[PDB]
Design a protein around this ligand. Structure first.
Ligand code: HAS
Ligand code: HEM
Ligand code: CUA
Ligand SMILES: [Cu+]
Lengths: 33, 166, 557
């Protein structure tokens, strides 16, 4: 019918990980640099 | 439904295409950011730099590991290393706290790796080549050289040391 | 002249059944060490024992060499050749030339076994990358140059079926799965040179007795030419299944023809010019070639990224349809009780973290922090090991009945699920333990369990690893009493055999014409495809060939 929350909650979570993950590392790349 | 969904679908899949692309550059941004500050260094040797793993041990600066530490400017230090079957030359690598180091590392056999517990020194050591990274240490103490590259059977017994003196 | 009247007037199932099963066996054998390798990182020395079970096992590494070569080269390869072949026909209910198809088959099998034997003897423990200068048997490189060439065949069996359908259905658009096959097998050709060159030019003289050394550097820039895509090669056979079929397992419809030709368009375009993220840590390679293949790669996330929406949406709608209600409602709505379905979808959730590893992995300097720790094997175990494989496995439970006419009984329909979930956890439990340990500076490909004094903070992912061990063991076996027991029993009632492969439909679209034509521009983009490689392995491949530096090969195992 209308707005697909599902897919979105998803591409979000995804988004959220790729963030938890990429900053997460950056930070470390740094602590080591 | 069955075509009502489609107009929307497509356009959401724009939201994404766009949003994705942004994040992405924001990354390309930051990655690039690191290219401009010091921590860029641990990036290998652009440029080629050939030797051969037969003669290497016998002569060159990799012959005599007395001469591995080697002062090259009021703070720079080329440190010849020989990664090789199931140790590194020398053990340990005496080096100064808070000064620039400039590792020069090759093999006399198969490819090993050279990864320094606590850093971004981390680099493949190829027989026939001189890999060149620059790090600058910062804290006194010890740092294990793991070799994260299947040198063969003494593999998981291929560690080393670098002390960073006070 | 057959008790089952198949291979007489509709037998391209004869071959796909085969490509398949062997693929599978491959997979069973090589994963046999999996859970050992897992305790090794668990920190349990399961080798003495595994040495007993298999007398023939020389080195930890020899396991990991089978384990890796069997499952990620062999098994993933037979799957494509099986899917990207038996599907494209069927869409078009036309028969693939069958001389070639078995040439194709046999080629691999020769190749496999021509290969395999160096290996169980322990005469080629150089690991699935076979990094020269470490020097494996000649029959190992030979066995795999065959084997592989043998998809070079299947590039055309399918391009035959394009050629043929397209001409006698003319000014008509290749329906998805043969427009899909074609870009795949196509893009896979460009790729396929990388290795192929390294083998003809280097690996094959060197080993046979013919030169005495290979320069290590172009060994693995040539190596990794291909060596990247080949993951994308492993995975796309499953992105087909998922894109075009799953939604009807789901009991709903692909939301979008274009977006699936589009994901695939990005593939053949962006898949092969990237083998310097694998080489972020190599010497003698100009920093800005790496910085590029940073961005190229990144651009290649775009597809699976934007698959994750198509796919998620499609399963969204299907949930709504069969009952789905809330923000997550639409989920219990889905088939949970059907393996055909369950497997790939788990494979997908898994897939989310693994995507995010992939990226880091590709953000150049960031890789300095993980390149060659437990990180990586986390990553791909998550990717190729959970996804492709769960996707492959799942597609047992409709592609057997179809292929065999033998029908899945509630017996193993119920056990399939026990297998699937009981394996999916493994991955996870393990994945966390690799990433973990990995961040912890634990090298990969390393009998760490033999220096058990050594990674003392590894402490705990190490439990996680160990446990995965026990769990995936349980998981693996189970799947033998499956794969075997769901084939063993004679009981075949091939009313089902007759094969309406569960294809899905489209939310038949608007721009689905002036546009989905542009993507059917096959040959054109296949030239921007070759155009790109050409600049990618541009003044770096040419380069190093000015200054090759062959070196003696060593065998230190
Ligand atoms: C089949 C296989 C693979 C695919 C998948 C894969 C994807 C990527 N990888 Fe990788 N990889 C690397 C970077 C990437 C990147 C950027 C991607 C991209 O494809 C990632 C894009 C993918 C995503 C962004 C995932 C999005 C999720 C989606 C699209 C699904 C959503 C799920 C849904 C919707 C289910 C929802 C349903 C419900 C019901 C709720 C790098 C570095 O650049 C290395 C070497 C690093 C080093 O230092 O050695 C590397 C190493 C590997 C090697 C190991 C190296 C070796 O053996 O020596 C193999 C095993 C491998 C396989 C595969 N890899 N990768
Ligand atoms: C049976 C369950 C499995 C377990 C417990 C398992 C575990 C592991 C572990 C612990 C490693 C690390 C070896 C090391 O880093 O020294 C590894 C390697 C690897 N696995 Fe498995 N794995 C399994 C199944 C699979 C499957 C199905 C595939 C194919 C998609 C796969 C592909 C690979 C590859 C390509 C490597 C690395 C090859 C190499 O590093 O030479 N694994 N596995
Ligand atoms: Cu040197 Cu492993
Ligand atoms: Cu890759």
């Amino acid at each position: 019918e209308e707005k697909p929350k599902g897919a979105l909650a998803v591409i979000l979570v995804l988004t959220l990980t790729i963030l938890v993950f990429w900053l997460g590392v950056y930070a470390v790349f740094f602590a080591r640099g | 439904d069955e075509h009502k969904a489609h107009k929307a679908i497509l356009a959401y899949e724009k939201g994404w295409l766009a949003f994705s692309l942004a994040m992405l550059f924001v990354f390309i941004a930051l990655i690039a950011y690191t290219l401009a500050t010091h921590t860029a260094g641990v990036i290998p040797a652009g440029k080629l730099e050939r030797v051969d793993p037969t003669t290497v041990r016998q002569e060159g600066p990799w012959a005599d590991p007395a001469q591995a530490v080697v002062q090259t400017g009021p703070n720079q230090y080329t440190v010849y290393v020989l990664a090789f079957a199931f140790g590194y030359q020398p053990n340990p690598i005496e080096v100064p706290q808070g000064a620039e180091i400039v590792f020069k590392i090759t093999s006399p056999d198969v490819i090993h790796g050279f990864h320094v517990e606590g850093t971004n020194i981390n680099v493949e050591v190829l027989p026939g080549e001189v890999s060149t990274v620059r790090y600058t240490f910062k804290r006194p103490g010890e740092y294990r050289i793991i070799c994260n590259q299947y040198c063969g059977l003494g593999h998981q017994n291929m560690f080393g040391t670098i002390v960073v003196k006070e | 002249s057959e008790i089952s009247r198949v291979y007489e007037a509709y037998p391209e199932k004869k071959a796909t059944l085969y490509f398949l099963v062997l693929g599978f066996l491959a997979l069973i054998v090589g994963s046999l060490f999996g859970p050992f390798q897992a305790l090794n990182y668990g920190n349990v020395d399961a080798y003495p024992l595994l040495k007993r079970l298999l007398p023939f096992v020389q080195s930890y590494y020899q396991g990991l060499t089978l384990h890796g070569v069997l499952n990620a080269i062999v098994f993933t390869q037979l799957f494509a050749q099986a899917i990207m072949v038996y599907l494209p026909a069927r869409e078009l209910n036309m028969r693939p030339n069958m001389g070639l198809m078995w040439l194709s088959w046999w080629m691999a099998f020769i190749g496999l076994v021509v290969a395999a034997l160096p290996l169980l003897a322990n005469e080629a423990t150089v690991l699935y990358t076979f990094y020269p200068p470490l020097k494996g048997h000649w029959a190992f490189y030979l066995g795999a140059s065959v084997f592989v060439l043998s998809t070079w065949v299947s590039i055309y069996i399918v391009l035959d079926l394009w050629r043929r359908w397209k001409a006698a259905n003319p000014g008509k658009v290749t329906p998805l799965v043969t427009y899909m096959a074609v870009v795949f097998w196509l893009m896979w050709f460009l790729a396929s040179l990388g290795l192929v060159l390294e083998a003809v030019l280097f690996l094959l003289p060197w080993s046979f007795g013919l030169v005495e050394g290979v320069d290590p550097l172009v060994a693995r820039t040539l190596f990794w030419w291909t060596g990247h895509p080949i993951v994308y090669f492993w995975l796309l056979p499953a992105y087909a299944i998922i894109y075009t079929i799953l939604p009807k397992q789901a009991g709903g419809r692909l939301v979008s023809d274009p977006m699936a030709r589009l994901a695939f368009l990005l593939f053949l375009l962006l898949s092969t010019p990237v083998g310097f993220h694998h080489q972020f840590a190599d010497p003698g390679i100009d920093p800005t070639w790496k910085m590029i293949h940073s961005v190229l790669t990144l651009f290649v996330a775009v597809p699976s990224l934007m698959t994750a929406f198509t796919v998620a949406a499609s399963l969204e709608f299907a949930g709504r349809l069969r009952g789905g209600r809330g923000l997550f409602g639409w989920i219990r709505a889905l088939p949970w009780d059907n393996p055909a379905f369950v497997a790939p979808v788990l494979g997908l959730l898994g897939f989310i973290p693994g995507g995010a590893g992939g990226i880091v992995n590709a953000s150049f300097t960031l890789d300095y922090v993980v390149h060659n720790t437990a990180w990586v094997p986390g990553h791909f175990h998550l990717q190729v090991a959970s996804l492709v494989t769960l996707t492959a496995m799942g597609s047992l439970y409709w592609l057997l009945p179809n292929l065999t006419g033998k029908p899945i009984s509630d017996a193993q329909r119920r056990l399939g699920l026990a297998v699937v979930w009981l394996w999916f956890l493994g991955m996870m439990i393990m994945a966390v333990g690799l990433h973990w340990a990995g961040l912890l500076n634990v090298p990969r490909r390393a009998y760490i369990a033999q220096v058990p004094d050594a990674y003392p903070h590894a402490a705990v992912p190490m439990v996680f690893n160990v446990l995965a061990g026990i769990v995936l063991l349980v998981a693996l076996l189970l799947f033998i009493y499956g794969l075997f027991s769901v084939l063993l029993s004679r009981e075949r009632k091939p009313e089902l055999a007759e094969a309406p492969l569960p294809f899905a439909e489209v939310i038949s679209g608007p721009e689905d014409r002036r546009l989905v034509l542009a993507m059917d521009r096959i040959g054109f983009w296949f030239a921007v495809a070759a155009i790109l490689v050409v600049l990618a392995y541009g003044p770096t491949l040419v380069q190093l060939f000015g200054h090759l530096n062959p070196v003696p090969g060593w065998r230190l195992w």
